[PDB]
Amino acid sequence: ANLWERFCNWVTSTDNRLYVGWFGVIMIPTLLAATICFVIAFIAAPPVDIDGIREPVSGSLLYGNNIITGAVVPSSNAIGLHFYPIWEAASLDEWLYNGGPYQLIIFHFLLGASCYMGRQWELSYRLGMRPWICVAYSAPLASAFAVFLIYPIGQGSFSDGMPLGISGTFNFMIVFQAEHNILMHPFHQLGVAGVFGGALFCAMHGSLVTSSLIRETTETESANYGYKFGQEEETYNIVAAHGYFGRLIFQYASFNNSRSLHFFLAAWPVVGVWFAALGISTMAFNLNGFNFNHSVIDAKGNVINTWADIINRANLGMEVMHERNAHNFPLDLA
Amino acid sequence: YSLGALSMMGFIATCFVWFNNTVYPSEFYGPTGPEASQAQAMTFLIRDQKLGANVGSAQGPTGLGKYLMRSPTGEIIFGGETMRFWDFRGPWLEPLRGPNGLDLNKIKNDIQPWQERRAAEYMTHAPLGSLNSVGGVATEINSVNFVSPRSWLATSHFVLAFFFLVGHLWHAGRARAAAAGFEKGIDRESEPVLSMPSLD
Amino acid sequence: LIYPLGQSSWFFAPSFGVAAIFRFLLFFQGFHNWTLNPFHMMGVAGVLGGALLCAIHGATVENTLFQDGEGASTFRAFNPTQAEETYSMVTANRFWSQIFGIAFSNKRWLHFFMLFVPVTGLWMSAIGVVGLALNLRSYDFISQEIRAAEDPEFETFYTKNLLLNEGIRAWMAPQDQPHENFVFPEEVLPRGNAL
Amino acid sequence: MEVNQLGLIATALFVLVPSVFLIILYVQTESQQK
């Protein structure tokens, strides 16, 4: 074998402790740059002029943040969708002021995670598996794309990207409700059905399989030792599990097919979360939640409030207070 | 492969209908988001100048110009949040454009009634609306039956492009598994991993 | 139950309705800053983590199946009473080990963990809401308020969120709490520029 | 910043004590006969 052949053999090697692969060849450096830039910024980055109004926001620990409040602040509204790599800045000091770390981190991140997904396909192919784990992974990835790239694109600025921080996350959320009434959007509701339901079926599945483990141990030892890695025989009794759950609700509401069951387990949170993502991604272009403001009117024409209008009042509080110095004109059009 | 390509094309179309006003003329499709934000700025710049404001020297609350400021490369642009959209270009705004960006003397002297009209129309037909098509911001009251065509077309094609990317992944991975002969699962008597050395 | 019991009345409990529940969410933000509460955060971790496990487990099983039929549709190639595992634990473990670095190797542990995560999450969240009944919130970081109070150039996403909360309270309270007879004059309503 | 001055000891003991409990248990586990 020549050098290139040997290299290819190493890269796609199924014996490497962590799989590299060709997707990994792109993924690794990008995720490293992103991680390192993130970590360093989170600790030490100076305040960032997020809203382009020369009103810098401190995101880093050393500049007075804790873990919950800390963030990497989105790049300046003055930049918008302009590409702002370090070399477009006159200095690192300027780069930092306008929030370059945000763009560097999220772009490397998105590239890296796309490659992570590709990498899941690649390795699944290398091990002789079916290939769709990566399809399962596409839901959170799509969400990340929705909040870091697609929303900024639609609104015309990365300053509107989700900040890389917990409290900044909440900020992004409150402002999103204010501008799109996301709660009243069926795609977000589908998202919610997705994660709540995901949790429900996870707990459910956990509980039924755990409930039907075949006795292989004594009471003075963990039941986990009742299963040995790689054994051919199944470790629980699915017929008993189905017997239980099928009587809990009714027979035909229960799975006797493990494959069908696990497919459902895959599909529900994943499809739902695809919808959450599409929710963010379409409100990105301001097709917003249901608007039932003043939907209810009496015979004379008096407005009769519904819960939608109270939501509306909350939304208003949010609208008027967010980014208190950025607006000069009465409408927030993006 | 075709699913992948159509997915790519879908995303391209989404951005096309969102930003471009040439092959998607705003006369037919409505204003772009950028067009409309800029249109708000134009409208009130006009209003206040009519009222006697010096819009060039008008300092906003932040220190930035209330109506006019510089882009990061120095171009004169509408100020406030609409700063993000300074890359917007439209037939109604460009006559106010000079070599260095918005020309203060043209603004002071050359704004025509058709521009005020156009700016007002676009400002008030910004591409914002509810799923049931209540026009305007999410907190706006029922009154206006409106969602911009730009939003319908951009959103529809994002959803579609995305699911087609999903389909791409599904079918490319399956074509791989089927070509290699394990799309139906692992051979019990020939489990590849079982012939591999342990990782540790 | 506990929450309204800690408040003035059942009035402030969630109402049984879609939008009403949403209002309940937004109230908790504005009034309790409930997102900032680490019990809710653990709730989040348990729910999203449970959904993650659900998806990842289903997919892993579905992509490590043994070929047990000739059908290209693989569901029929299973029999409930069969003794053998329907998917390869060994291949799944290697896959995730090489992809992610760690992997389940024990199915019983995997599934107990699948029980544990969402159940524990919800439980933590329940504890936090029990705190909210008494208005015993994580509303503020004191160090933050002292700094921001003395230093008007100091801004974090935390202070920004408090502005949002303050808006929520003033704009929603009169209609949300009609028994209070709130009258908030235009001039007292907190607003930023223009909006 | 005007932090709670006990936050340091609180956090430190919160990490260390159970960490230590667990390390004790692991180590006495490994040394049992194979």
């Binding site: 962590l18 890695f229 | - | 760690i102 | -």
Partner: peptide, 30 residues
């Protein structure tokens, strides 16, 4: 000091990742 603590805890976690991955107890087929 807060910052020291936070960064410290984080570092402990990354180290933990490292041990948990490369120095895990190996899975064995019986």
């Amino acid at each position: 000091m807060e910052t020291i603590t936070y960064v410290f805890i984080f570092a402990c976690i990354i180290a933990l990742f490292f041990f948990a991955i490369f120095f895990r107890e190996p899975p064995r087929i019986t």
